[PDB]
């Protein structure tokens, strides 16, 4: 028997066109450029899902360095003292303390100073 | 056998392989033939000996 290709192609192409909503110009209207746009966006998402962790760690390091230079300490010396004192708090929590609990951050910095000497 | 529960003997029937239907099956573009020879052409090939 004959199998004419109805109802199956449009359903498959419309999903790809719908996935490209918000793209400039005809990238959200035409199947052929929408397909390439969707593929490229998936690849970009896959790569940036790795780059995001590095970006946030760099932000935390910069913030901790800024907060620790006010205690007459580098980021390098402070991290060495914290490792040498036995404290195991990651950069995320240290940046949080630096931003909105500066007294506790100063306490931790004092402990790190004690450990160094 | 009720004609609505026909289960043929297991392993006696397999599924035919269809070539040239997309790259997800591994038999897509060139259809198991390689690139640009005499053996990649329709009806192409040499004699038996």
């Amino acid at each position: 028997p004959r199998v004419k290709g109805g109802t199956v192609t449009r359903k498959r192409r419309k999903k790809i066109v719908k996935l490209a909503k918000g793209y400039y110009g005809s990238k959200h209207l035409l199947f052929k450029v929408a397909n390439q746009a969707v593929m490229k966006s998936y690849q970009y998402a896959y790569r940036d899902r790795r780059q995001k962790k590095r970006d946030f760690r760099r932000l935390w390091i910069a913030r901790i360095n800024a907060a620790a230079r006010m205690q007459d300490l580098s980021y390098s010396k402070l991290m060495h003292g914290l490792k040498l004192a036995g404290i195991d708090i990651n950069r995320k929590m240290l940046a949080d303390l630096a931003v909105n609990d500066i007294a506790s951050f100063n306490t931790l910095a004092d402990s790190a100073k004690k450990a160094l000497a | 056998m009720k004609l609505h529960e026909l289960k043929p003997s297991e392993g006696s029937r397999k599924e035919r392989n269809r070539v040239g239907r997309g790259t997800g099956s591994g038999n897509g573009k060139t259809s198991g033939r390689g690139h640009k020879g005499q053996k990649a052409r329709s009806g192409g090939g040499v004699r038996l000996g």
């Binding site: 932000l59 935390w60 800024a66 995320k92 940046a95 630096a98 931003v99 | -």
Partner: protein, 143 residues
């Protein structure tokens, strides 16, 4: 999740006046660029502005080690054929110290719209008199 991101106007921006007598050009400019960027605060958010305003006085006495006062050249091109012009660093220090400091500092700021906004926060004077006494700036000491 939970990481602090600053908002426009949420961080106080202060005013500083820096005396540039005897300091090396690049060694002053690095510190000033860090101050303008906002990297000396635990509120530093990369995508907005949290830095301070800077006033530089006595720019006419900025230092230039070696033979840089005569052997360092600043080039411009007008985009007309054969329209390249030169100028030595000692001549600019004698005549336009403000523009020397501005070029030096501007080369050290990010090259985008935010960097162009940060450049507008720098005021350079060749003498020891500034006109921003209404903002009540403080004295900043280097290092």
């Amino acid at each position: 999740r939970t990481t602090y991101m600053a908002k426009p106007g949420e961080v106080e921006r202060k005013w500083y006046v820096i005396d540039a007598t005897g300091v090396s050009l690049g060694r002053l400019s690095s510190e000033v660029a860090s101050i303008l960027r906002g990297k000396n605060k635990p509120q530093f958010t990369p995508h907005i502005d949290t830095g301070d305003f800077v006033i530089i006085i006595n720019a006419g006495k900025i230092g230039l080690t070696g033979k840089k006062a005569t052997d360092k050249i600043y080039y411009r091109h007008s985009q007309y054929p054969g329209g390249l012009k030169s100028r030595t660093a000692g001549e600019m220090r004698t005549n336009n110290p403000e523009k020397l400091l501005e070029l030096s500092i501007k080369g050290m700021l990010p090259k985008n719209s935010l960097g162009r906004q940060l450049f507008k926060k720098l005021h350079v004077y060749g003498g020891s008199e500034h006109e921003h006494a209404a903002q009540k700036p403080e004295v900043y000491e280097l290092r």
